Design a protein around this nucleic acid. Structure first.
Lengths: 163, 163
DNA sequence: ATTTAATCCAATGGTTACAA
DNA sequence: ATTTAATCCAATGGTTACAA
């Protein structure tokens, strides 16, 4: 079992048997690299070429010895990486604030949803399109919970423009 | 069981318990329409929206009473529809030629591969990209056999440019 | 009382074995 | 001798039930 994450500020190294949030984000960067490698091979073989991080890419990460990578964990934190990509400044501020308050990782993760929904609102509530417009982010499936929140919010907003 | 197809020339109506090739191509147009309808609903519900004809679209076609549509048959003839889309003139000529010669449908279908491979050759051997550049065609998965032929051919051509 | 990662599941793209 | 469409299958995206 890997050491658990804790909330850290940008650049901070976590003390003890813990990992910090810059390490978490680096894990996404590593999966991206694995995808590039799977695409290179698929194209060279004339096989169908994935455009997202799939089960195919997780098997490849494992085979390459990155045993500390697994799908359930990457899916769990994808929306946190999304915020870091889409608005780094706001990602940084939210980390600093959660650290200073002594919150746990589970709590900080829940807080990442709201600013994403707000970004969606400024782009026609189309969050699939927001993801696809960012080169780092276009290869990640939109998490269901996040898609649900954007839809709930759009229905609340249109109910409100009936005024 | 639907009546079987036979090779016909553009505009020809098939006599007897038979269907012609314009009817076959019209079946693809109908699946496209079903996809548009599935996309409309997915987007309105904030659910993930398919970009290809999937199992989801075949279930929808059936439910809507288009019982004569089925996945195995649509996958079987997709490359023939591709040629009709990408180079209609050449599609027409090949039908006229196969009719006049008395060939069966299975035989005409095999002949559709070659001109597709030639189209791929003029676009960097990237047949996924050829499909995606045509609005009618971008929603169909590239059939495996066709992807294999384009790859075999590219390897033959690069072996040949060693001269 | 929290956080992690193995397990399981319905549905998928693709094919085979069969029927007419 | 041909042509059609039911059936089956390994692998997928997604989640749950569990362990540490």
């Amino acid at each position: 079992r890997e050491h658990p994450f804790i909330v850290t500020e940008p650049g901070e190294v976590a003390r003890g048997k813990k990992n910090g949030l810059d390490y978490l984000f680096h894990l996404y960067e590593q999966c991206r690299e694995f995808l590039l490698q799977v695409q290179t091979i698929a194209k060279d073989r004339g096989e169908k070429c994935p455009t997202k991080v799939t089960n195919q890419v997780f098997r490849y990460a494992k085979k390459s010895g990155a045993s500390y990578i697994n799908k359930p964990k990457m899916r769990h934190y994808v929306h946190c990486y999304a915020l870091h990509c889409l608005d780094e400044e706001a990602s940084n501020a939210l980390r600093r604030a959660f650290k200073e308050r002594g919150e746990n990782v589970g709590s900080w993760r829940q807080a990442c949803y709201k600013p994403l929904v707000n970004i969606a609102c400024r782009h026609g509530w189309d969050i699939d399109a927001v993801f696809n417009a960012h080169p780092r982010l276009s290869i990640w499936y939109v998490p269901t919970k996040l898609r649900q929140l954007c839809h709930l919010e759009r229905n609340n907003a249109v109910a409100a423009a009936a005024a």
